[PDB]
Structure 1
């Protein structure tokens, strides 16, 4: 997987400036970092570079989805710089941009051992290649400016390391576009890829995938290929309402809905039937009159529908029972995406109950893999990081491995 690729343990960094993509896309609440998992996970690679004599380590990441507009009031990485201090035992220089002559000067010839964190890559449309303007109109990036963006990032180091497993499914500029002669996979990239390579070679069966969360447009497009690998799927969280509206003609109110994915729902169900994959969808819900921690709440079922102006933000008790039945049958589980808005206590019961079931499954020998920026925060919140088989820093990235793909961030590394 990385067998063919240059990795950091084989990269001479002595006297070299290292430019490192990392996944510091950490969850935030009340403007605080709620889980430093993804930051801590990159420390081994950073520390290795500094201990083996790197002149500098320049760290670069996105945070959230600002869609190519500078929104430091809301998606700045400065809080991550602070947290990384503590985890490293080294101070960190935070720059307010990631490209341009001022950044290039700050990284051109740093004091020996400097750790530099750049501002959010996605404040530039050239990272993703597309985004929105500040008025919210979709925009494409211009090829020549994408090249200039990649050229600028490439000047910030002499060698490149990608340790950003959580983002490895994204063919973004900082992930596939850095032009330096040595492009090496970091130790987190190696740890995660090696874990999944073995867990996915010959899964214990039944193999259950649990797909929830809120990235519906993206992740509904992964189900088709996953249906060739798994024996059961829970489709919950925000993902479920697109399925229920199409299959059950359910009223879903203002719940998350994907117009494009709705067009393939019946094809996915046909393929699940063809491949013998049991699909478990929720049958009841905790509702809210608005997207707010303190919203008024209600209950609902698929038969009742969700009232107009209301949204389903958690599953209900009968859904938790059905989810639990699927977990009990499983011998291997991969779970990405909470089955409700677990950050808010009114909407956390379904995710907590499913966590309880997954922990119990682990205790009787199920191989249990939970991954994602927010889903791993469930493990931190309820203190189950040591009670499942593997907590991954990749969510969507892990689902694309489950599909059987080579991740773009891996593919772009140097061959041995």
Structure 2
């Protein structure tokens, strides 16, 4: 960011600031379970308001609505309520992000107005592909032109979304496009932590986003010495390598095609892969599912999903943590939100905290994965908790993030 415009250098007095933030907070029963991401944007929002901004217009995605409006399930209205108490100022929530009324509402606001727009991904044009459909070029441009109308200057503080070349992150057309203080803070910490990692350097890759994150491993394999592939990531690997019965467990069809290549590469680079060997199983995807056990040998019965690892998996995971002097962890190794399926991420968290206390550099990142830290009160018991998960895995790969690359130059 050493040659991008940042917010400390952007005169905002009398200007309308349009700001990309990652307010993609975890939700349950329609309430926010962790305001980490909203809090982390506050310093940039306060700075703008403290420095004479006419308005701050805030925009984000929440979830993966895939280009269909879904106020029911993926509305940002709750974030607007939480943002009020953290700023101690009112937030005008708007029920759309583009179009004549959003434009009217943001055209010339009272001085100091903060406005939050609705979920960008209710419009196919943010990503723009969705549902199955490709966005139309003319309409992407139109959607991008609408968003650009809402401020005089642009700030991108959406670190957690920086890996995404979506319309709101890279397509806003204003003379001045500044990185915010959170983007700044996360990029510096990682440029430090990734410069000369302590070794063995372990990556711990779990979660639910298999299609996307399975595609990151190839470049990661050039950087790390060990890799835990757990959570929802494990089942593509285990079907291919062990012909394991997997049931309704998460599976990536594309990912499975390259699994043999990534294992060949892991070997060629001396990167030790630790995959799970037992499981807690579910009869459906529900907190109060009937539950069971399987090993890789037994397989998982048709009709059932693996939603946590078992105790023998926890033991292997612990051994990898014990050998590490640096850890980057994105993705829980089970569905930690539900207690029937939380023991394995809780045990792995326990290892990671014990590892930190004897000098291991521990870095946990992501919306859901940082919520592990909140839930077990380990936020100050590891080295760094980042608002980015995927964004951080893409910095580990050695990429310039598209949301950083689209910023103005000095």
Alignment of 1:4-83 (within 5 A): 4-83=3-82
Q: What do you get for the CA RMSD once the two structures are aligned?
A: 0.3
Q: What is the alpha-carbon distance in structure 1 between the residues aligned to residue 282 and residue 43 of structure 2?
A: 42
Q: Secondary structure at the match of 2:178?
A: strand
Q: How many residues align?
A: 410
User: How many angstroms does 1:234 deviate by?
Assistant: 0.1
User: How many angstroms does 1:140 deviate by?
Assistant: 0.6
User: How many angstroms does 1:165 deviate by?
Assistant: 0.1
User: How many angstroms does 1:335 deviate by?
Assistant: 0.1
User: How many angstroms does 1:379 deviate by?
Assistant: 0.2
User: How many angstroms does 1:129 deviate by?
Assistant: 1.3
User: How many angstroms does 1:43 deviate by?
Assistant: 0.1
Q: Secondary structure at the match of 1:384?
A: coil
User: How many angstroms does 1:344 deviate by?
Assistant: 0.2
1:45-81: CA deviations, max 9, x gaps? 0000000000000000000000000000000000000
Partner of 2:231 in structure 1? 237
2:210 matches 1:216: yes
Q: Secondary structure at the match of 2:146?
A: helix
User: How many angstroms does 1:213 deviate by?
Assistant: 0.2
Q: What is the alpha-carbon distance in structure 1 between the residues aligned to residue 346 and residue 62 of structure 2?
A: 26
2:262 matches 1:263: no
Q: What is the alpha-carbon distance in structure 2 between the residues aligned to residue 9 and residue 317 of structure 1?
A: 49
1:190-245: CA deviations, max 9, x gaps? 00000000000000000000000000000000000000000000000000000000
Q: Secondary structure at the match of 2:52?
A: coil
2:105 matches 1:111: no
User: How many angstroms does 1:364 deviate by?
Assistant: 0.4
Which of the numbers 145, 152, 159 marks the counterpart of 1:151?
A: 145
Using the size of structure 1 for normalisation, the TM-score is: 0.98
Q: Secondary structure at the match of 1:126?
A: helix
Q: What is the alpha-carbon distance in structure 2 between the residues aligned to residue 105 and residue 184 of structure 1?
A: 24
Which residues of structure 2 form unaligned runs of 5+? Answer: none
Q: What is the alpha-carbon distance in structure 2 between the residues aligned to residue 59 and residue 286 of structure 1?
A: 41
Q: Secondary structure at the match of 1:264?
A: helix
Runs of at least 4 residues of structure 1 off by over 3 A?
none
Q: What is the alpha-carbon distance in structure 2 between the residues aligned to residue 397 and residue 246 of structure 1?
A: 27
Q: Secondary structure at the match of 1:230?
A: coil
User: How many angstroms does 1:32 deviate by?
Assistant: 0.6
User: How many angstroms does 1:373 deviate by?
Assistant: 0.6
Which residues of structure 1 form unaligned runs of 5+? Answer: 133-137
Q: Secondary structure at the match of 1:263?
A: helix
Partner of 2:324 in structure 1? 330
Q: What is the alpha-carbon distance in structure 1 between the residues aligned to residue 86 and residue 381 of structure 2?
A: 23
Q: What is the alpha-carbon distance in structure 2 between the residues aligned to residue 390 and residue 87 of structure 1?
A: 22
Q: What is the alpha-carbon distance in structure 2 between the residues aligned to residue 200 and residue 395 of structure 1?
A: 15
1:152-188: CA deviations, max 9, x gaps? 0000000000000000000000000000000000000
Q: What is the alpha-carbon distance in structure 1 between the residues aligned to residue 218 and residue 375 of structure 2?
A: 32
User: How many angstroms does 1:102 deviate by?
Assistant: 0.2
